[PDB]
Write a protein that binds this DNA or RNA. Structure first.
Ligand SMILES: Cc1cc2c(cc1C)N(C[C@H](O)[C@H](O)[C@H](O)COP(=O)(O)OP(=O)(O)OC[C@H]1O[C@@H](n3cnc4c(N)ncnc43)[C@H](O)[C@@H]1O)c1[nH]c(=O)[nH]c(=O)c1N2
Length: 452
DNA sequence: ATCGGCCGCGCA
DNA sequence: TTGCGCGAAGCCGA
């Protein structure tokens, strides 16, 4: 392995027990530097390796959609892990408390976890550390270049980062060694329970039939690769030319998978790098899964207040501040955005996409978020509403990409200043009639007339 | 260090 | 739609 992928959280004396992978971000058996390094740590100690996963009360914040998607992936995983002689454990409760006392009851010798920049994982690590005595290691198994090596600071923009990332690629774009099995050694309750809790929340139509359409993305690792293979076969060729067209389905659709870690962007890059297509579409594509995915981890990592206004740049703040007192053309409540009840049938279209399919088109996520700012009573409330709805309804929600992209949208983060307007100040602008020139908006709107 | 280099709209 | 030069605007980094 490349040792720069490991960062020791806590130094201690190794016990003669198992090596415990605390799986959290990367829910896949294959192409997992964290599970691979736990195996290795467990090989040269003549100890087994085990995976432990903590199911927290964070599901009641979102929807059945994300909760099945994650719990069906887990159920596949369990078989995969088990076929490698790796037992996998499922703790119901609070990582800080639960993993600690688990490390206790099993006499773990070493503790490993994947990397994730979201505030709450630092809280749980920091509590975990304060209650164990064995080494605690962290591995970046989500980014091609570990987040702390691509950049030490907050990168102001894509092209300040892009050079630093691309110097390090020859060294970190490597092949994955295969998970060598162990030599020595209840999820269906958890599903049916958690579903009965979420059920009063489900998004129904005027009739009981649920809004959510689950047949657009199957969960799991096996699914995730048939999406990557199909992309490379079918859509990668035209990606750079038709990605901004919400009517052609040319996106890679891999983002529900990556969020849950059911597939490795490192594998995707390896596979794309070796595919033969339009160079500009590889170039377009690598830049999203390479520069924009990982600058998003950098954003949350180096700015703990990423889900708030303060993390904007001083020009964006100063600008939005001066237009706090402007007269909003319209003002809608959260409930009114949430139900696609604005004057903008194109905007209600996109929210209709988000509502029923669980994934809004990459281009329309920009428009949808800017109009939220334009038609709310304050930037803070606009952030508050874009965050809530992105996370409540998007299958890829609750993700660094999420905050890094609402922050681009509402706040200039990783962007520049444009001509000054009412309400929006100097934040980039998007218009109905700018979409008219780029794609058949009449056709998007027709797709989604599920407003009942 | 000094300066290039990151949507909307007219027009053909 | 389909591409281009132009516009408004701030700041990094070489
Ligand atoms: C308002 C708003 C809200 C969100 C987001 C953007 C905006 C403007 N994003 C980011 C982006 O819009 C999203 O990754 C794509 O819609 C994912 O669809 P595909 O995987 O099909 O992208 P596509 O195949 O075109 O891109 C490939 C990959 O590049 C990365 N990427 C693309 N666009 C990016 C962006 N703008 N920022 C960061 N990484 C990017 C992702 O890893 C994506 O899987 C996001 N993404 C996400 O997964 N979860 C979320 O909750 C949000 N939230």
């Amino acid at each position: 392995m490349n040792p720069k992928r490991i960062r020791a959280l806590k130094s201690g004396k190794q016990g003669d027990g198992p090596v415990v992978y605390w799986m959290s971000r990367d829910q896949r058996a294959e192409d997992n530097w964290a599970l691979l390094f736990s195996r290795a740590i467990a090989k040269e100690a003549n100890v087994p390796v085990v995976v432990v996963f903590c199911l927290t009360d964070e599901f009641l914040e979102a929807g059945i959609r994300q909760y099945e998607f994650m719990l069906k992936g887990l159920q596949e995983l369990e078989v995969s892990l088990s076929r490698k002689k790796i037992p996998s454990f499922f703790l119901r409760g609070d990582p800080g408390e639960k993993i600690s006392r688990f490390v206790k009851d099993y006499n773990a010798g070493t503790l490993v976890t994947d990397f994730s920049p979201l505030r709450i994982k630092n809280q749980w690590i920091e509590k975990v550390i304060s209650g164990i005595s064995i080494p605690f290691f962290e591995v970046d198994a989500h980014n091609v270049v570990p987040c702390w090596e691509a950049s030490q600071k907050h990168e102001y923009a894509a092209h300040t980062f892009r050079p630093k990332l691309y110097a390090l690629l020859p060294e970190f774009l490597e092949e994955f060694p295969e998970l060598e099995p162990n030599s020595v050694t209840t999820l269906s309750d958890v599903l049916e329970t958690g579903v009965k809790a979420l059920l009063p929340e489900r998004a129904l139509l005027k009739n009981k039939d649920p809004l959510f359409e689950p047949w657009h993305f199957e969960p799991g690792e096996k699914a995730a690769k048939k999406v990557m293979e199909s992309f490379i076969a079918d859509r990668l060729d035209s990606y750079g030319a038709l990605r901004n067209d919400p009517t052609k389905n040319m996106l890679s659709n891999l983002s529900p998978y990556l969020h849950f870690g059911q597939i490795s962007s490192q594998r995707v890059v390896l596979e794309v790098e070796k595919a033969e297509s339009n160079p500009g579409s590889k170039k377009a594509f690598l830049d999203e899964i390479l520069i924009w995915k990982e600058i998003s981890d950098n954003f949350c990592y180096y700015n703990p207040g990423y889900d708030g206004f303060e993390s904007f740049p001083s020009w964006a703040k100063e600008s939005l501040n001066a237009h706090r007192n402007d007269v909003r053309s319209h003002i809608y409540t959260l409930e009114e955005f949430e139900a696609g009840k604005t004057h903008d049938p194109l905007w209600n279209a996109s929210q209709m996409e988000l509502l029923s399919t669980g994934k809004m088109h990459g281009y329309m996520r920009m428009y949808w978020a800017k109009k939220i700012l334009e038609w709310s009573e304050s930037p803070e409330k606009a952030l508050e509403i874009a965050i809530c709805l992105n996370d409540r309804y998007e299958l890829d929600g609750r993700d660094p990409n999420g905050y890094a992209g609402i922050a681009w949208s509402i706040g200039g983060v990783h962007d520049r200043a444009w001509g000054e307007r009412e309400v929006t100040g100097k934040i980039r602008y998007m218009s109905y009639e700018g979409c008219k020139r780029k794609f058949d908006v009449k056709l998007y709107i027709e797709k989604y007339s599920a407003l009942d």
